[PDB]
Structure 1
């Protein structure tokens, strides 16, 4: 539909990523949220991916 799915990958070298949706036709900016990571076992930043 309108909202396609993206992949919020972590900031550290660990290959852990969260998936979510985003309205590309409303927001061209990127997503930077903070979430927990099961590998680093701390809280890091999260960059977007596809």
Structure 2
């Protein structure tokens, strides 16, 4: 629906990413979260990016 799919890009520089959804209208702020990254093996902070 209104929610648009986005990618959370690992900040480890390894190119791994997650996919989630959000709506731009209510929450224009960037999405940032600590998620596990398999290739580097460590909990690193992910920032959203365009899909």
With structure 2 as the length reference, what TM-score do the two structures score? 0.92
RMSD: 0.6
Gapped regions of structure 1 (runs ≥ 5): none
State the shift of 1:12 in Å: 1.1
With structure 1 as the length reference, what TM-score do the two structures score? 0.94
Gapped regions of structure 2 (runs ≥ 5): none
Q: Deviations over 1:1-50 (max 9, x none)?
A: 20010000000110100000011010000111001000110110001111
State the aligned residue count: 50
- The 4+ residue runs of structure 1 with deviation greater than 3 A are none
